[PDB]
Write a protein that binds this ligand. Structure first.
Ligand SMILES: CCN(CCO)CCCOc1ccc2c(Nc3cc(CC(=O)Nc4cccc(F)c4)n[nH]3)ncnc2c1
Lengths: 43, 271
């Protein structure tokens, strides 16, 4: 389990993220998605 | 766009009917999320592609503070990956089992959150159909997150016939083979509120026949420790007749909810 992913390093990062939320609609909701029709076809 | 190589993988968080969930960090943004990993050949052999598709379609288009977010999704040669909100306090069911029962503040809070999330769903003609503790997660400040949409449906016009959900939560109309509508979620909310307060669901029996009998008779037996307000809300949700159940706005306005809820909305991104 890498360091970031447990104990206080995790706790602090989570707190941080709660109080400084990022723009997920832009950072992720803006990026292309595979067509649902295509999820079981070739990548 | 996304590949698995864009994420640091932390550790596993849970199972799932189709696959494993991992704690993950998107490297670019150092943003902590969860990644649900599904194997394509397993899904095809189980025959569940269409079912998985419909679940993704519903969850990926809902944005509410009490519904677990699906940020995006991607796939490679062998796997499909769902990018999900991380719920730092984890499974609600584990918390109920540890405490036995929740107090009135914690219960009322959760009810206000549930009702707000469900009303968001219903305004979009989405029926959930399997509200229960095991389908709920908790955020950083304990906030309810509806996590699992496995039985959910978009039902813009037609009544439904599918028997679905979980034994102790089934509404009468399901058991009786009637058509159903969004008002099934009202009934399940009522069962949930009782289970939060009592630690067992209201119709618990060792035989499926007896549980079904108790449900269709609405054989509700309130323990004496329950407050009058809590009983009043549960009683108004657990109506035999769907049209007589308290609406979700009615749950959010109920005096027991107003008096006891300590709901806080999470901070949101600011320009
Ligand atoms: C108090 C600290 N605890 C200690 C744990 O050792 C809890 C730490 C956090 O625990 C969890 C557990 C499960 C999680 C979890 N589980 C999860 C997410 C989902 C949504 C899901 O899988 N969506 C989905 C959508 C379409 C198709 C499909 F197959 C699935 N279901 N279950 N998601 C996010 N964070 C979680 C945090």
């Amino acid at each position: 389990i890498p360091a970031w992913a447990s104990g206080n390093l995790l706790t602090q990062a989570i707190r941080q993220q709660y109080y400084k939320p990022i723009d997920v609609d832009r950072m992720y909701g803006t990026i292309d998605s595979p067509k649902l029709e295509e999820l079981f076809n070739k990548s | 766009k996304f590949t698995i190589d864009d994420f640091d993988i932390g550790r596993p968080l849970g199972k799932g009917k189709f696959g494993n969930v991992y704690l993950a960090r998107e490297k670019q943004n150092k943003f902590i999320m969860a990644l649900k990993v599904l194997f394509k050949s397993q899904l095809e052999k189980e025959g569940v592609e269409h079912q998985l598709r419909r679940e993704i379609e519903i969850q990926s288009h809902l944005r509410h503070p009490n519904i677990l977010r699906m940020y995006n999704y991607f796939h490679d040669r062998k796997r499909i990956y769902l990018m999900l909100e991380f719920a730092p306090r984890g499974e609600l069911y584990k918390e109920l089992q540890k405490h036995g029962r929740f107090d009135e503040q914690r219960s009322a809070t959760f009810m206000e959150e549930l009702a707000d999330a469900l009303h968001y769903c219903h305004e979009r003609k989405v029926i959930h159909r399997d509200i229960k503790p095991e389908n709920l997660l908790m955020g950083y400040k304990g906030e309810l997150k509806i996590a699992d949409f496995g039985w959910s449906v978009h039902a813009p016009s037609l009544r439904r016939r599918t028997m679905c959900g979980t034994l102790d939560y089934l509404p009468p109309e399901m058991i009786e083979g009637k058509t159903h509508d969004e008002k099934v979620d009202l009934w399940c909310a009522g069962v949930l509120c009782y289970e939060f307060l009592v630690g067992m669901p209201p119709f618990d029996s060792p035989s499926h026949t007896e549980t079904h009998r108790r449900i269709v008779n609405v054989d509700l037996k309130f323990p004496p420790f329950l407050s009058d307000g809590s009983k009043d809300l549960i009683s108004k949700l657990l109506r035999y007749h769907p049209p007589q159940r308290l609406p979700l706005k009615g749950v959010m306005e109920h005096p027991w909810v107003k008096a006891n809820s300590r709901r806080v909305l999470p901070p949101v991104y600011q320009s």
